[PDB]
Write a protein that binds this ligand. Structure first.
Ligand code: TB7
Length: 382
């Protein structure tokens, strides 16, 4: 069973593994980067890109993701995966939506509409991008809606222009209540010692409970606590990995990180009494994916005369200028609220990346019945 898999029956893991690998690229770019990410959000947009691209452009994408979205049986597996995530038995709220915004006078290949509907239950949204500010507002309002108001201005000044012809977006929203809330009385400020010899007062939470816990050591010998913090629906939890030593950089963990690794942790954990100290944080970040996707073999889609979008339209040539992801998380005593908006844009440009860096720990938000990794991030260590 570990060596042989039926791909549609394994799509959750495959999509999660691909999305994790994209996070590694983002993490490997900057040391100790405080960033929040959605593996599931990037997998959903790139899966859409498998329907829109053709030729080598599509080949390259299917290769990196390590599965084909149009394989026999994928459709019913995707319907089942959506239901499992969305259903009310989860208690904690999850919401995922996908959209393709396309220049209105653009003739699309006949076979595209049924595919997009079979796999994404979605319908291409025609917009006239030559009306730049209106179009920016149309896509922005849609993102603001499907993230429940959390991401209001994904697309700022210059993110789209008259030459924009295609935008693909996924909006992902998560709202969970801890199974056991952290008690208000044990919230306190704690000091964090920066590298420049200075200090900052950070609000800290704490709770003692029986937590699924495991120890973990890497090939080079470095130790980490892995604790699982559950949401009240019993289907979702936050896995937390924290290093034992201040001399071990988090890259020793993130460089070997995988979806199977997290599955192995969850599989090999035991319930133990532990005190948990976790920060009360809000993190908002936006990462470029162009380079990270280029590093994983997907270069054709960004290149003016090599790019092949013929499964969507052979009417006119198209290539990707921007691939990005804007993400927001808020963790308090009663729970977590997180959202992400993943976008691939033709034309215009992406403002330079703003990067914050500070010795971090790792968190993973994971839907357990399916193995779907929804959010993961590197945040400031207590
Ligand atoms: C596994 C992978 C990340 C490739 O895709 C999925 O998990 N699927 C969920 C499907 N997306 C989807 N499914 C939907 N189902 C009903 C209503 C709306 C939607 C929608 O907007 N998107 C694709």
């Amino acid at each position: 069973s570990h060596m042989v898999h039926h791909p549609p029956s394994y799509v959750a893991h495959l999509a999660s593994d691909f999305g994790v690998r994209v996070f590694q690229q983002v993490a490997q770019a900057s040391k100790d980067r405080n960033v929040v990410f959605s593996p599931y959000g990037v997998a959903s947009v790139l899966a859409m890109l498998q329907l829109t691209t053709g030729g080598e452009t599509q080949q390259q994408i299917q290769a990196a993701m390590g599965f084909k979205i149009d394989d026999k049986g994928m459709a019913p597996a995707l319907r089942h995966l959506y239901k499992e995530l969305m259903g009310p038995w989860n208690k904690d709220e999850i919401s995922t939506t996908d959209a393709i915004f396309v220049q209105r006078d653009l003739k699309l290949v006949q076979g595209f509409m049924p595919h997009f509907f079979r796999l994404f239950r979605s319908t291409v949204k025609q917009v006239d991008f030559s009306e730049v500010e209106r179009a920016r507002f149309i896509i922005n309002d849609w993102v603001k809606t499907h993230t429940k108001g959390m991401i209001s201005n994904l697309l700022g000044k210059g993110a789209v222009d008259q030459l924009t012809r295609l935008v693909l977006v996924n909006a992902l929203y998560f709202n969970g209540q801890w199974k056991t809330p952290f008690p208000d009385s044990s919230t306190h400020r704690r000091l964090f010692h920066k590298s420049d010899g200075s200090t900052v007062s950070v609000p800290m939470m704490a709770q003692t409970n029986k937590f699924n816990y495991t120890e973990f050591t890497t090939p080079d010998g470095h130790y980490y606590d892995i604790l699982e913090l559950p949401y009240h629906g019993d289907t979702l939890s936050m896995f937390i990995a924290a290093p034992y030593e201040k001399e071990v950089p988090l890259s020793a963990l993130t460089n070997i990180l995988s979806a199977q690794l997290i599955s192995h942790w969850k599989g090999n954990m035991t319930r133990l009494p532990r005190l948990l100290v976790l920060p009360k944080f809000s993190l908002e970040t936006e990462v470029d994916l162009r380079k990270p996707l280029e590093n994983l073999g997907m270069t054709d889609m960004f290149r003016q005369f090599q790019a092949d979008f013929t499964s969507l339209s052979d009417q006119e040539p198209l290539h990707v200028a921007q691939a990005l992801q804007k993400v927001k998380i808020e963790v308090n005593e009663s729970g977590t609220v997180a959202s992400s908006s993943t976008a691939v844009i033709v034309s215009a440009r992406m403002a330079p990346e703003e990067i914050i860096m500070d010795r971090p720990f790792l968190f993973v938000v994971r839907h357990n019945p399916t193995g779907t990794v929804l959010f993961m991030g590197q945040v400031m260590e207590p």
